[PDB]
């Protein structure tokens, strides 16, 4: 086929070593024009490239620029009519349009259907681009609303149904019987007495797992691309990832706060022993994020140095805490090995993936140069997308655990730092640790009790 000239169309230039590199062919690098062309190739459908592109394109192209590029890709100019056909059109007769029909059937219609397929995948899996930019959605609805054609009528309707469902879903069922909600000292409804030791450790780990599962499942892969969660626009590009990270920081600091602010040695042992029991139920539910929240708390500077406290921790709980720490040893080797074999539901730990993504961002160049021509390094984005795909494969499996609205709201409003900054609070926790257990030369003072309720744990065995 005779593709349109370059003076009227920019997506028909032949491939060369200066505009696209390969590795269905796998694209390695290329210009933004060559990526849009291969994103909507007329010879075959490329679902893997479409999924990887729309997840990672924001690291090299703005959403407004992408919509303009795919609209320009859509409006393919038709060739000039032949002389014999133009005089039939002048007389009001129907032209032959032999080559014109073959060009529409073999190029224009296949490309235009690929552009619409990209538009459907965009609004279906990355609709947040249109929530953050209303004008982007106005352009998208304006574009698909003015598409004329019979073969494209079904595509316009499907994209419309998805856009409408996304707007309606913005306002807001077990397969098995969930276990019974466990309670300890705090009776149901008495939200004034909810605390670490008053609530049941089984239900503390259950509700935290339900809370952390939802926070994990709301994280989209694009929030982990281009290190956007560490830039100025982190609040706009990674709101769910930051909500997941800030929750992990709040819960970790709360565990440390419950330990160092318990000045009595006997009560502090019961506090640490209860948190280890909470970690044990985290392992049962395969909530690996909750497991390492306890590991990070026990390894922090104020808590790890409490030799007098951990001396009274029973040996069965020491081994449970040891096996939980070994998940982080050797670049989280054992954590990946356990997660890869565990069946969902589960809550992954984001730390190692963010670490391996950042090493890919820093270890690979943004652009590749060929004959002095900068090309978007797309294999770099594909490698980052593969990592986000490993975390995302558990995004859809729910837990078979009943939500307790009072307990869930208690952990959502945990503010251990109160109104002070983190550096001031972390320095306060360490100075509090030196107070409850001074260093080697200084003696160990006694402190009065602060809890008036029994310190005995009800256990981690579900009472059925
Ligand atoms: C198991 C455990 C733990 C766990 C949570 N901590 C650890 N576990 N294993 C090993 C082999 C560790 C090796 C180094 C290491 N870090 C601490 C932070 N500074 C850098 C070195 C912490 C380890 C903490 C506290 C107490 C206990 C107890 F044995 F008492 F239960």
Question: 299: CA distance to ligand 1 center in Å?
Answer: 6
User: Counting atoms of ligand 1 from 1, which one is nearest the CA of 322?
Assistant: 1
- Does residue 456 belong to any structural domain of this protein? yes
Bridge partners (DSSP) listed for residue 287: 347
Task: Find the DSSP H helices in 83-217.
Answer: 83-90, 98-103, 109-125, 128-132, 134-145, 153-168, 201-217
Give CA angle at 19 (67, 66), nearest 5°.
5
Q: State whether 441 and 378 are in the same domain.
A: no
- 68: nearest Cα among 13, 110, 11: 11
| 293 Cβ contact partners less than 8 Å away, ≥ 6 residues apart | 248, 251, 252, 255
Map tokens 């690996």 to a residue: 288
Q: Rounded to an integer, what distance in angstroms lies between the CA atom of residue 307 and that of residue 438?
A: 11
Q: State whether 375 and 328 are in the same domain.
A: no
End-to-end CA separation in angstroms for the chain? 72
Q: State whether 212 and 144 are in the same domain.
A: no
Which approach determined this entry?
X-ray
**Of 310, 318, 325, which is best to mutate to test ligand 1, by the most ligand atoms within 8 angstroms of its C-beta?**
325
> Ligand 1 in contact with 318 (CB < 6 A)?
yes
Q: State whether 282 and 144 are in the same domain.
A: no
Q: State whether 296 and 381 are in the same domain.
A: no
Q: Rounded to an integer, what distance in angstroms lies between the CA atom of residue 110 and that of residue 127?
A: 25
Q: Rounded to an integer, what distance in angstroms lies between the CA atom of residue 431 and that of residue 256?
A: 12
Map tokens 């959605």 to a residue: 137
Q: State whether 237 and 304 are in the same domain.
A: yes
Q: Rounded to an integer, what distance in angstroms lies between the CA atom of residue 323 and that of residue 337?
A: 13
**CA 446, 450, 452, 458 torsion: positive or negative?**
negative
Protein residue with least CA distance to atom 20, ligand 1: 299
Q: State whether 82 and 25 are in the same domain.
A: yes
Q: State whether 161 and 22 are in the same domain.
A: yes
Name the domain boundary from 393, 420, 455: 393
- Does residue 173 belong to any structural domain of this protein? no
- Does residue 174 belong to any structural domain of this protein? no
Instruction: Pull the structure tokens for residue 151.
Output: 């073969």
- Does residue 262 belong to any structural domain of this protein? yes
- Does residue 342 belong to any structural domain of this protein? yes
Helix, strand, coil percent values for the chain (each to nearest 5): 60, 5, 40
> Ligand 1 in contact with 334 (CB < 6 A)?
no
HSE toward the beta carbon, residue 306, CA cutoff 13 A: 32
- Does residue 102 belong to any structural domain of this protein? yes
User: Counting atoms of ligand 1 from 1, which one is nearest the CA of 317?
Assistant: 31
> Ligand 1 in contact with 298 (CB < 6 A)?
yes
Q: State whether 310 and 364 are in the same domain.
A: no
Give CA angle at 272 (268, 275), nearest 5°.
140
Give CA angle at 374 (7, 6), nearest 5°.
10
| 247 Cβ contact partners less than 8 Å away, ≥ 6 residues apart | 211, 212, 215
- Does residue 133 belong to any structural domain of this protein? yes
Question: 415: CA distance to ligand 1 center in Å?
Answer: 26
Q: Rounded to an integer, what distance in angstroms lies between the CA atom of residue 364 and that of residue 29?
A: 12
- 179: nearest Cα among 285, 320, 90, 88: 285
> Ligand 1 in contact with 285 (CB < 6 A)?
no
Q: State whether 216 and 103 are in the same domain.
A: no
* Distance, C-alpha 293 to centroid of its chain: 18
> Ligand 1 in contact with 321 (CB < 6 A)?
yes
Q: Rounded to an integer, what distance in angstroms lies between the CA atom of residue 166 and that of residue 164?
A: 5
Q: Rounded to an integer, what distance in angstroms lies between the CA atom of residue 325 and that of residue 333?
A: 11
- Total structural domains in the chain? 2
**CA 145, 150, 155, 161 torsion: positive or negative?**
positive
Are the C-beta atoms of residues 127 and 170 closer than 8 Å to each other?
no
Q: State whether 377 and 429 are in the same domain.
A: no
Name the domain boundary from 371, 393, 415: 393
Q: State whether 67 and 187 are in the same domain.
A: no
Are the C-beta atoms of residues 30 and 378 closer than 8 Å to each other?
yes
- Does residue 139 belong to any structural domain of this protein? yes
Name the domain boundary from 393, 420, 449: 393
Question: 288: CA distance to ligand 1 center in Å?
Answer: 17
The residue segments making up the domain with residue 73 are 2-167+351-393
Tell the burial category of 158 from Cβ atoms under 10 Å away from its Cβ (0-12, 13-18, 19+).
Answer: middle
**CA 188, 193, 194, 197 torsion: positive or negative?**
negative
């Amino acid at each position: 086929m005779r593709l349109p000239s370059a003076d009227v169309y920019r997506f028909a230039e032949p491939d060369s070593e200066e505009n696209i590199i390969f590795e269905i062919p796998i694209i390695k690098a290329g210009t933004v024009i060559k990526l849009i062309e291969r994103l909507t190739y007329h010879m075959y459908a490329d679902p893997n490239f479409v999924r990887t592109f729309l997840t990672t394109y924001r690291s090299f192209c703005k959403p407004q620029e992408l919509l303009s590029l795919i609209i320009e890709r859509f409006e393919i100019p038709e060739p000039e009519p032949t002389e014999a056909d133009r005089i039939a059109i002048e007389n009001g007769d129907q032209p032959l349009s032999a080559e014109l029909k073959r060009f529409r059937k073999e190029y224009i219609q296949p490309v235009q259907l690929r552009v619409l397929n990209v538009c459907r995948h965009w609004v279906e899996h990355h609709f947040y681009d249109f929530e953050r930019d209303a004008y982007l959605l106005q352009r998208m609805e304006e574009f698909i609303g003015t598409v004329r054609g019979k073969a494209m009528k079904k595509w316009v309707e499907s994209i419309t149904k998805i856009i409408q469902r996304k707007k309606i879903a913005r306002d807001n069922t077990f397969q098995s019987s969930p276990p019974t909600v466990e309670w300890h000292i705090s009776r149901p409804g008495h939200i004034e007495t909810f605390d670490l030791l008053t609530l049941h450790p089984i239900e503390i780990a259950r509700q935290l797992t339900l809370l952390e599962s939802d926070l994990y499942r709301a994280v989209q892969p694009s929030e982990l691309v281009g290190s956007v969660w560490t830039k100025e626009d982190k609040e706009i590009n990674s709101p769910n990832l930051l909500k997941m990270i800030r929750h992990t920081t709040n819960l970790t600091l709360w565990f440390e706060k419950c330990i160092v602010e318990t000045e009595n040695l006997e009560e502090r042992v019961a506090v640490v022993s209860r948190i280890i029991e909470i970690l044990q139920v985290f392992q049962e539910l395969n909530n690996f994020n909750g497991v390492l929240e306890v590991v990070s708390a026990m390894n922090s500077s104020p808590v790890y140095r409490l030799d007098h406290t951990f001396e009274q921790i029973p040996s069965r709980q020491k081994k449970i805490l040891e096996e939980a720490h070994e998940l982080s040893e050797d670049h989280y080797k054992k954590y990946l090995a356990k997660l890869r074999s565990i069946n969902p539901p589960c809550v992954p730990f984001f730390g190692i993936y963010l670490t391996n993504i950042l090493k890919t961002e820093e270890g690979n160049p943004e652009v590749l140069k060929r004959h002095g021509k900068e090309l978007i390094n797309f294999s770099k984005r594909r490698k980052v997308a593969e990592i986000t795909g490993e975390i995302q494969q558990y995004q859809n499996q729910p837990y078979c655990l009943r939500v307790e609205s009072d307990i869930k709201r208690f952990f959502e409003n945990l503010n251990p730092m109160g109104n002070s900054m983190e550096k001031e609070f972390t320095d306060y926790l360490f100075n509090k640790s030196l107070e409850i257990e001074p260093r080697n030369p200084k003696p160990l003072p006694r402190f009065p009790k602060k809890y008036s309720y029994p310190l005995k744990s009800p256990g981690v065995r579900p009472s059925n």
